[PDB]
C-alpha cells in the first residue's frame, strides 16, 4: 500500500 512498490 506504500509508495515505490511498482
Amino acid at each position, epitope marked *: *500500500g*506504500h*509508495a*515505490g*512498490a*511498482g
Partner: antibody, heavy 117, light 114 residues
C-alpha cells in the same frame, strides 16, 4: 512481543562514517518498509531514507550522496551507513516504520552519533 | 525537494482549551492519505497518535482527531489536558510507483500558559 533493537554508533571523526543496525523481533524485516530518521540536539525530526518492503532504497535529496540503507533477511536487520560525516551530522538516529498510512508503527530506541575530533 | 510546514511553530494554551495545528505539504501525499501525527516530549522518543489522516491508534484518547486531504491536514485536540503539552510533528509519505519518500514538519511546541 514486537520490538526493534537499535545498535552501533557513538563517536565518529569528521569525514568518517557511521554504521547503525536495527534487529526486528516478533516479526520479519521483509514484511514492511523501514525508514531511518535523525534528530539533532534541540532540533526537529529529519528523514534520511526509506527501504521499501520490496527491498528498494530511496533517500532524501540531502542524504543520497552519502547514505546506504540495506537489510539482512537472515539476521532480520536493517542497516544505515553514512560516510563523509560532518559536525552537523551529530544527532540521535532512529530506525522506524513510520506508519503514515498503515496501522503498524515501530521505532528503535535511538542512538547518539557525535561527529567531532 | 518535498517540504512540510506546520502552523504555528509554538503556541501557549491552557488546560481545557481547543487546539488546532495545521500542516501543509508542498505536494499531495501518497494516495492523498498517508499522513501521521506524532507526539514527542523532552528526552523521549516520538510517539504516533494518528495515522492515515484520521485513524486513531489503540490507546490514544478520543480528544485527538485528524482531518484534511492531499496537501492540507489538521490536528485537533478538543480539550487540552496536562499530558498533551509537548511537540507535535506531521509526517507524510510521498513517491510514485518507482520511488518513495517521507518528510516531517518542523514541529509545533504546545506549552502551558500561565
Amino acid at each position: 512481543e514486537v520490538q526493534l533493537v537499535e545498535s552501533g554508533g557513538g563517536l565518529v571523526q569528521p569525514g568518517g562514517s557511521l554504521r547503525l543496525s536495527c534487529t526486528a523481533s516478533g516479526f520479519s524485516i521483509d514484511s514492511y518498509g523501514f525508514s531511518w530518521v535523525r534528530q539533532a540536539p534541540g532540533k526537529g525530526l529529519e528523514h534520511i531514507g526509506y527501504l521499501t518492503a520490496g527491498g528498494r532504497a530511496f533517500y532524501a535529496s540531502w542524504a543520497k550522496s552519502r547514505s546506504t540503507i540495506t537489510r539482512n533477511t537472515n539476521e532480520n536487520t536493517v542497516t544505515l551507513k553514512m560516510n563523509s560525516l560532518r559536525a552537523e551530522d551529530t544527532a540521535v538516529y532512529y530506525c522506524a516504520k513510520l506508519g503514515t498510512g498503515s496501522r503498524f508503527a515501530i521505532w528503535g530506541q535511538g542512538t547518539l552519533v557525535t561527529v567531532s575530533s | 525537494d518535498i517540504q512540510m510546514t506546520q502552523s504555528p511553530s509554538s503556541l501557549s494554551a491552557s488546560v481545557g482549551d481547543r487546539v488546532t495545528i495545521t500542516c501543509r505539504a508542498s505536494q499531495s501525499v501518497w494516495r492523498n492519505k498517508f499522513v501521521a501525527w506524532y507526539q514527542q516530549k523532552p528526552g523521549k522518543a516520538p510517539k504516533r497518535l494518528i495515522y492515515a489522516i484520521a485513524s486513531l491508534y489503540s490507546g490514544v484518547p478520543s480528544r485527538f482527531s485528524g482531518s484534511g486531504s492531499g496537501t492540507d491536514f489538521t490536528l485537533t485536540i478538543s480539550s487540552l489536558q496536562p499530558e498533551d503539552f509537548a511537540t507535535y510533528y506531521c509526517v507524510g509519505h510521498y513517491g510514485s510507483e518507482n520511488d518513495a519518500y517521507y518528510a516531517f514538519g518542523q514541529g509545533t511546541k504546545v506549552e502551558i500558559k500561565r
